[PDB]
């Protein structure tokens, strides 16, 4: 960075880091279910007297 | 003041003690494009003798 104070100025940085991290987790589950269905033979469907 | 064949000194160096630079907009920059010019204007100067 550069600028004006008291006259001119500047300045120069570097910088680095390094980070760690860990973690846990729980996940739960429940559920239900329904169904229906229908079936047919076209032809030889019916049945009389 | 610099004598007969020496160098020119400086305005505004970047030093601790300055003064900020002088800005032009784009119109006075065209005014230096045509023909009108840049007069040095001393008004009061203070000696000892």
Sequence with gaps: NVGYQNG???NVTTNYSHTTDNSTAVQDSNGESWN???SINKGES???? | YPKKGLSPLA???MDQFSSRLIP???????????????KLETTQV???F
Excluded at chain 1, 46 to 49: D, F, G, P, S, V
Excluded at chain 2, 24 to 38: E, F, P, T
Aim: net charge positive; glycine share 10%.
């Design chain 1, 8 to 10: 001119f100025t500047a």
């Design chain 1, 36 to 38: 229906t269905g229908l």
């Design chain 1, 46 to 49: 019916a049945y009389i007297n």
């Design chain 2, 11 to 13: 305005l505004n160096t």
């Design chain 2, 24 to 38: 032009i907009n784009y119109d006075q920059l065209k005014k230096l494009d045509a023909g009108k010019q840049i």
């Design chain 2, 46 to 48: 203070s000696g000892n």
